[PDB]
Chains A and B, each alone.
With several copies, the nearest count.
Chain A
Amino acid sequence: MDLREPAALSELRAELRAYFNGLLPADERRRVGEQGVGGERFREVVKMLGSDGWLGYGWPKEYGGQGRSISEQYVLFDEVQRAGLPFPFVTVNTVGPTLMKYGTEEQKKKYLPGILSGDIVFAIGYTEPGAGTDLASLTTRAVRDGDEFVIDGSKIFTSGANTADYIWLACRTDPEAPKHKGISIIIVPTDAEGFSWSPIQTVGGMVVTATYYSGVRVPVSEVVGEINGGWKLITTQLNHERIGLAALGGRMIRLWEDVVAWARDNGVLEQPWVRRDLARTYAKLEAMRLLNWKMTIAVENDELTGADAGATKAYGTETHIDVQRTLTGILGAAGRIRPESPGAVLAGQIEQLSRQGIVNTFGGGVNEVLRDMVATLGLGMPRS
């Protein structure tokens, strides 16, 4: 039972840390992190990462990737988010890998090289106003017309649709089939006639979108996998997505450390209640950091249970909120000051993240569903 980072990973880490912190000045880097995949510098960042080879860091070498281990991919995902940079997670961790497994040779030739270089970015079109947690009830329609599909519907919370080149779109291709046997994944260019989007400004600052499909026509060959078998894609190949989300914890550890240094320097650290609060969040961040590595090692050995996955995700995202609340309390009167305003502490990052962390308890799996799965798959409870 060795819980220590290998010396190889620590060197990689310190080098990635400097690289990512060096791409942009700190104030500019804060802004790009807030803006996420919807921002006007996202594609710029994606292109820099692609040009320097980081986008296919974890991809197999036979697809042009560096073929690095799951542990090294995890350090990369950790350090890019720790720097506050956006990273094209859905493209590199969902779209790429699914195309490698389910893609035609023509689909692979068309999308993979551009994803690698940062010239092609996807957004995921799953969620609908009427189908969120219950995604299998989606109703965006794809009707076959000869060699084409005609797509009519709308999606909501299509993150990055406004900067994406393609939508990874989930559609109802068989209205009569049982809900799980009637969905297809179809790739839709964001410049297709009949496609549009509208902004949704979030409280955290990033802009997401609703997307609309009015008579959009795509070739049948742009289906990924089996027609009516897209639910099998939506529910599999999730392990990269899981470690990507777990890697967000690195940033909260950074900000914990930065608050301690802030509090040491101005005397706030002398207060018993600050010390208690720092101690409790330290203990919770330790567990988070170790559970996140344990999941990562499991993925590396192909031994990750859905129970451990969901348990780790629910604890981690709830711990981010806890740490954000608690650290904000330690900041005192400065804790309410937004980024870009005078008096902000640590540039307002904790104030801003508090308004973002409140989404991750239902992104990447709804925590109530994940606790059901822990009880059912983890403890053998019958389904609720």
Chain B
Amino acid sequence: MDFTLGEELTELQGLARQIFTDHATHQRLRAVETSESRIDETLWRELAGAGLLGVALPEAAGGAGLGLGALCVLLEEQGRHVAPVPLWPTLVAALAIAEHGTAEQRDLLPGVVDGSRRLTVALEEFGVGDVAAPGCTAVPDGDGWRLSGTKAVVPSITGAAHLLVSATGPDGPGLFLVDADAPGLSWERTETTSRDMAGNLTLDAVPARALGPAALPWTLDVARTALAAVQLGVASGALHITASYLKEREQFGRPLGTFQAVQHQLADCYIEIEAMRVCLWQAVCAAEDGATDGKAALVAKWWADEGGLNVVHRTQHLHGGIGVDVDYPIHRYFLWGKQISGTLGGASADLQRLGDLIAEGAA
């Protein structure tokens, strides 16, 4: 095998690193995280111009056709800079449409590539919230559909032109495209842990168009993989910052990084991140081979949800007082890692879902 990025993805990684580094400064983050949209619109525009919105999307749509691994390289760099833009909701939605959408829906994708059209995904509900069995209902309306129900904390909803909403129709769970101005659709802005502005969506017989019959299980697995990629970047950036901090911070006449207990917490972070990374790329390779049993994506997401949350808790404790200060960078990684580790369910929910797939695959 091979555990190295090729030429193209390494180039992509460097371009994403430069752009996130240019924009995700202390000053910009503070302004964006207190704005009405909570979205860095300047960064979004630089990503579009640089080709990064299109790199994972089909060539027909004006993108590069590099697919899921391209998206994960970009999302890892995003996480490393905790930069606030709705990359995974827009680009996961865009990939769902490229793969399972009608020709009409694929006409949306050039606008995503050039940066004028943002999307989001509404995959969660309050309460039990089984993402594979949405409570939200889809009722046929001639050749289209109408949706009724509620979706919880839909990410980065401000300025989204379209939503992919999961719902249950007469033939089971599905994924439906909804325009953000559609009649009967409303939401309440709600602030999340990461300081994103999400929306709690109310759907009163909202008109919608179905994607292909396989869209929802496929999309849940791609979203789990994308979230793992963000969390890998979050955990990696967090460890890097903490390491540099502890080399310099002295107590008792020596750097804190000379204490054996400190070195072991750092080493445990390092181990968790390495495990997270191999399990992420296994999920990417499984997606490439058309795997549909969903195991590899859940392994990857569990590592994100358990190991990744472990890392940002350690990097919080190791900083002591300075790490609680919102004018110091590390608290943001805790915020991101905390929120990502519960997105589409937490670690325990993943282990239950994964254990059922193992049992069903055994028989």
A interface residues with partner B (beta carbon < 8 Å):
1-6, 71, 127, 130-134, 137, 156-157, 200-204, 208, 260-261, 264, 266-280, 282-284, 286-287, 290-291, 293-294, 297-298, 307-308, 311-312, 314-315, 321, 325-326, 328-329, 332-338, 340-344, 351, 354-355, 358-359, 361-362, 366-368, 370-372, 374-376, 378-384
Contact sample, A vs B, 6 pairs, CB 8 Å cutoff:
A266-B127, A273-B348, A282-B354, A358-B317, A361-B317, A371-B261
Q: Could you tell me if B271 and A315 are in contact, using CB atoms closer than 8 angstroms?
A: yes
Query: Which B residues are in CB contact (< 8 Å) with A2?
Result: 1-2, 285
- Distance (whole angstroms) from the CB of A109 to the closest CB of chain B: 35
Q: Could you tell me if A261 and B362 are in contact, using CB atoms closer than 8 angstroms?
A: yes
Q: Could you tell me if A133 and B251 are in contact, using CB atoms closer than 8 angstroms?
A: yes
Q: How far is the CA of A269 from the CA of B361 in the complex (A)?
A: 12
- Distance (whole angstroms) from the CB of A275 to the closest CB of chain B: 3
Q: Could you tell me if B284 and A204 are in contact, using CB atoms closer than 8 angstroms?
A: no
Contacts A202-B326, A297-B2 known; list 12 others, CB within 8 Å: A1-B3, A1-B4, A137-B252, A264-B362, A268-B127, A311-B267, A329-B346, A332-B345, A337-B191, A358-B323, A358-B324, A366-B320
Q: Could you tell me if A380 and B243 are in contact, using CB atoms closer than 8 angstroms?
A: yes
Q: Could you tell me if A372 and B275 are in contact, using CB atoms closer than 8 angstroms?
A: no
- 8 Å CB contact of A375 from B266, B326, B359: B266
Q: Could you tell me if A291 and B126 are in contact, using CB atoms closer than 8 angstroms?
A: no
Residue B141 at the A interface, CB < 8 A?
no
Query: Which B residues are in CB contact (< 8 Å) with A133?
Result: 251-252, 320
Q: Could you tell me if B270 and A378 are in contact, using CB atoms closer than 8 angstroms?
A: yes
Q: Name the residue on B nearest A384 (C-beta).
A: B260
Q: Could you tell me if B325 and A1 are in contact, using CB atoms closer than 8 angstroms?
A: no
Residue B95 at the A interface, CB < 8 A?
no
Q: How far is the CA of A326 from the CA of B309 in the complex (A)?
A: 11
Query: Among residues 270 to 314 in chain B, which have CB atoms less than 8 Å away from a CB atom of chain A?
Result: 270-271, 274-276, 278-279, 281-282, 284-285, 289, 295-296, 298-299, 302-303, 309, 313
Give 1 or 0 for each of B322-353: 1 = CB within 8 Å of chain A CB.
01111100010011001100110111111110
Q: Name the residue on B nearest A272 (C-beta).
A: B352
Q: How far is the CA of A276 from the CA of B276 in the complex (A)?
A: 19
Query: Which A residues are in CB contact (< 8 Å) with B349?
Result: 271, 273, 329
Residue B180 at the A interface, CB < 8 A?
no
Q: Could you tell me if A282 and B281 are in contact, using CB atoms closer than 8 angstroms?
A: no
Residue B188 at the A interface, CB < 8 A?
yes
Query: Which B residues are in CB contact (< 8 Å) with A157?
Result: 321
Residue B50 at the A interface, CB < 8 A?
no
Q: How far is the CA of A333 from the CA of B135 in the complex (A)?
A: 14
Query: Which B residues are in CB contact (< 8 Å) with A275?
Result: 352, 355-356, 358-359
- 8 Å CB contact of A333 from B153, B188, B299: B153
Q: How far is the CA of A134 from the CA of B338 in the complex (A)?
A: 30
- Distance (whole angstroms) from the CB of A260 to the closest CB of chain B: 5
The B interface is mostly helix, strand or loop, or mixed, namely helix
Give 1 or 0 for each of B147-191: 1 = CB within 8 Å of chain A CB.
000001100000000000000000000000000000000001111
The verdict on A203 contacting B267 (CB below 8 Å), with A1-B6, A157-B321, A276-B352 known, is: no
Q: How far is the CA of A214 from the CA of B175 in the complex (A)?
A: 64
Residue B268 at the A interface, CB < 8 A?
yes
Residue B37 at the A interface, CB < 8 A?
no
Query: Which A residues are in CB contact (< 8 Å) with B128?
Result: 266-268, 270-271, 332
The winner among A315, A343, A359 for most chain B CB atoms within 10 A is A343
List the 4 shortest-distance A-B pairs measured between CB atoms, nearest first: A275-B355, A329-B346, A375-B263, A279-B355
Q: Name the residue on B nearest A352 (C-beta).
A: B193
Give 1 or 0 for each of B9-24: 1 = CB within 8 Å of chain A CB.
1000000000000000
- Distance (whole angstroms) from the CB of A233 to the closest CB of chain B: 21
Q: How far is the CA of A314 from the CA of B250 in the complex (A)?
A: 23
Residue B363 at the A interface, CB < 8 A?
yes
Q: How far is the CA of A208 from the CA of B299 in the complex (A)?
A: 39
Q: Could you tell me if A201 and B274 are in contact, using CB atoms closer than 8 angstroms?
A: no
- Distance (whole angstroms) from the CB of B303 to the closest CB of chain A: 7
Q: Could you tell me if A297 and B1 are in contact, using CB atoms closer than 8 angstroms?
A: yes
Q: Could you tell me if B190 and A342 are in contact, using CB atoms closer than 8 angstroms?
A: yes
The verdict on A379 contacting B1 (CB below 8 Å), with A314-B271, A336-B153, A338-B191 known, is: no
Query: Which B residues are in CB contact (< 8 Å) with A372?
Result: 260, 263-264, 267
Q: Could you tell me if B2 and A1 are in contact, using CB atoms closer than 8 angstroms?
A: yes
Q: Could you tell me if A1 and B69 are in contact, using CB atoms closer than 8 angstroms?
A: yes
Query: Which A residues are in CB contact (< 8 Å) with B339?
Result: 336
Q: Could you tell me if B263 and A333 are in contact, using CB atoms closer than 8 angstroms?
A: no
- Distance (whole angstroms) from the CB of A146 to the closest CB of chain B: 35
- 8 Å CB contact of B278 from A261, A271, A272, A290: A290
Q: How far is the CA of A276 from the CA of B347 in the complex (A)?
A: 11
Q: Could you tell me if B263 and A334 are in contact, using CB atoms closer than 8 angstroms?
A: no
Query: Which A residues are in CB contact (< 8 Å) with B105?
Result: none
The winner among B243, B296, B346 for most chain A CB atoms within 10 A is B346
Q: Could you tell me if B251 and A358 are in contact, using CB atoms closer than 8 angstroms?
A: no
Q: How far is the CA of A110 from the CA of B302 in the complex (A)?
A: 53
Q: How far is the CA of A131 from the CA of B250 in the complex (A)?
A: 9
- Distance (whole angstroms) from the CB of B225 to the closest CB of chain A: 13
Q: Could you tell me if A354 and B356 are in contact, using CB atoms closer than 8 angstroms?
A: no
Q: Name the residue on B nearest A310 (C-beta).
A: B267
Q: Could you tell me if A379 and B266 are in contact, using CB atoms closer than 8 angstroms?
A: yes
Q: How far is the CA of A270 from the CA of B129 in the complex (A)?
A: 12
Q: How far is the CA of A272 from the CA of B194 in the complex (A)?
A: 29
Query: Which B residues are in CB contact (< 8 Å) with A333?
Result: 124-126, 129, 152-153, 342
Query: Which A residues are in CB contact (< 8 Å) with B358?
Result: 260, 275, 278-279, 282
Q: Name the residue on A nearest B278 (C-beta).
A: A290
